[PDB]
Amino acid sequence: GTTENLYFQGSMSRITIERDGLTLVGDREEPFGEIYDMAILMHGFTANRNTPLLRQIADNLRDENVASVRFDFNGHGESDGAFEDMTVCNEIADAQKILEYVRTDPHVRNIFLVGHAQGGVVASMLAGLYPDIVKKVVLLAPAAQLKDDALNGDTQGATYNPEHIPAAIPFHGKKLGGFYLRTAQVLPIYEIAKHYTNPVSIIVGSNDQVVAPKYSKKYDEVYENSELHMVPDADHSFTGQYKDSAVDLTAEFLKP
Amino acid sequence: GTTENLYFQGSMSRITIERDGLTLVGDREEPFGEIYDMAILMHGFTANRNTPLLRQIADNLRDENVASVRFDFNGHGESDGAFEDMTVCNEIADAQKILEYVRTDPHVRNIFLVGHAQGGVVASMLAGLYPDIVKKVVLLAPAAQLKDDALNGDTQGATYNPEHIPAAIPFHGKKLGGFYLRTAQVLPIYEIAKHYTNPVSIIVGSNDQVVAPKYSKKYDEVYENSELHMVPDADHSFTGQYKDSAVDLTAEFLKP
Ligand SMILES: CCOC(=O)/C=C/c1ccc(O)c(OC)c1
Ligand SMILES: CCOC(=O)/C=C/c1ccc(O)c(OC)c1
């Protein structure tokens, strides 16, 4: 009475890519098979490509025969660049080189974007710039609030005059670029995101203490083909018990 | 009978600066003195920092005791980076590192921007992001048309589907990045430039056949404190006779 139950199948690769003289470091996960859809997974502000959330997303996508790549943004994790030089704009430039890496790959069928938080802002504006290429987008707690906070001169507790932004501000151990804050103020987030008319899923925790729920709702009102999933009680980063519910909504939207 | 006519006084330095792991190469010109105003001079699309126009502007500013720096943008002249990776966005990032270099210099009093054509677009966007820092701006045939052309699918004769832009398009023997064109299409040129309320002088040739002078008129309408100088018969580049008129209006506006 022997049983055998397959739970893991495929390949995992450490990838490096160049953007303007910076090395970006990523992990590629593929299922077995010559052709597969491929998701680009994008982390949040001060996070990295190997959060529990993004690992579990790559794992459950692979179970559904969907490949994934997840890169450290410039100034984060193992990728090059000073944290203080990172902006939402140069993270969009990182994501574009990753999209070109994937679009050029002979194994790939359709390209999906998955962005958590600031990674969700990046994903939404990349999709707006490549709506001909991106087939599905998942936004998790997309952090469009970073624009309103930069305009109000209050970024998660760090205060500054929004009309005389310093060169850099102290931020929880780190140095946040004046340029991050000046570009955040004028980011055409919703203006660019609305060019993407293909399917979008927006996943938000009811208990998100970092980004107000209003931001996710505005994405839902601006997208032609959106669904909005409010996960009861979930936190900002979908941690512990809330990880599984974000992963299940992601995998179920992207699966063949 | 003795005559003495001074025709050159100051210091010229070759500068290099880093932006995201790219070296940018520039020429710095100063007059004699411990404290001076400093103009950042910004070249156009496929040009470099040593066009006749920009050398003569640096020369005439130094005679009026105004220092200047002129850098090759990424993908141009002697600077790092492939032409095909250049966007308007990453030239604004180049210009921000130049602004930081100049703003950090103990000799520099007030900072002026001077931008020709695409350089004018860059200068206008940087001034909008740093309206608290930039004291004067001169735009010479600012090429805000690059947005409308990208949306039309016709960039100086290079044609493409504006909703399915290729990875790169052949462009006068070089390769122009798809990302240049997709970001050109959504650039909030006038919306960002508007935030600059200090003095601006806009210098346009009535016979510009590369950028419609209407784009310079639009800047004049958008700015709080602008003057418009339409140079009868002058071409896009301000070649020959037209160079002295462009130089003279620049030096007159910035002089102490
Ligand atoms: C992308 C990971 O981002 C988050 O987890 C939260 C984002 C966030 C929210 C408000 C802000 O003012 C902000 O400015 C830097 C960022
Ligand atoms: C900045 C130097 O730029 C020029 O001399 C002219 C620029 C120009 C005009 C129309 C365009 O569609 C364009 O697309 C790249 C560029």
Numbering used by the authors:
A (entry chain A), B (entry chain B): -10 to 245
What does the paper say about this structure?
Feruloyl esterases (FAEs, E.C. 3.1.1.73), a subfamily of carboxylic acid esterases, are mainly associated with the release and exploitation of HCAs from plant cell walls. In this study, we aimed to obtain and characterize a feruloyl esterase (LaFae) from Lactobacillus acidophilus. To further investigate the active site configuration of LaFae, crystal structures of unliganded and ethyl ferulate-bound LaFae were determined at 2.3 and 2.19 Å resolutions, respectively. Seven α-helices surround the β-sheets and form a core domain that contains an active site with conserved catalytic triad residues (Ser106, Asp197 and His225).
We also resolved the crystal structure of ethyl ferulate-bound LaFae mutant (S106A) at 2.19 Å resolution and analyzed its substrate binding mode. Ethyl ferulate complexed LaFae crystallized in the C121 space group with four molecules in an asymmetric unit. In a close-up view of the substrate binding site of the complex structure, the electron density map (contoured at 1.0 σ) of ethyl ferulate was observed near the S106A mutation position. Notably, the carbonyl group of ethyl ferulate was discovered to interact directly with the NE2 atom of His225 at a 2.5 Å distance and the 4′-hydroxyl group of ethyl ferulate also formed hydrogen bonds with Asp138 at a 2.4 Å distance. The substrate-binding pocket of LaFae comprised of hydrophobic residues F34 and V200 and polar residues Q107, Q134, D138, T144, Q145, Y169, D197 and H225. A structural superposition of the ligand-free form and ethyl ferulate-bound LaFae yielded a root-mean-square deviation value of 0.261 Å over 209 residues, indicating a highly similar overall structure. In the substrate-bound conformation, two anti-parallel β strands formed a sheet within the cap domain (α5–α6 loop region of the apo structure). Additionally, the comparative b-factor analysis showed that the binding of ethyl ferulate caused a reduced structural flexibility on the α5–α6 loop region. It is thought that this loop region plays a role in the open/close movement of LaFae when the substrate is bound. Furthermore, the conformational change of the cap domain region in substrate-free, as well as the ethyl ferulate bound structure, presented open and closed movements of LaFae when harboring ethyl ferulate as a substrate.
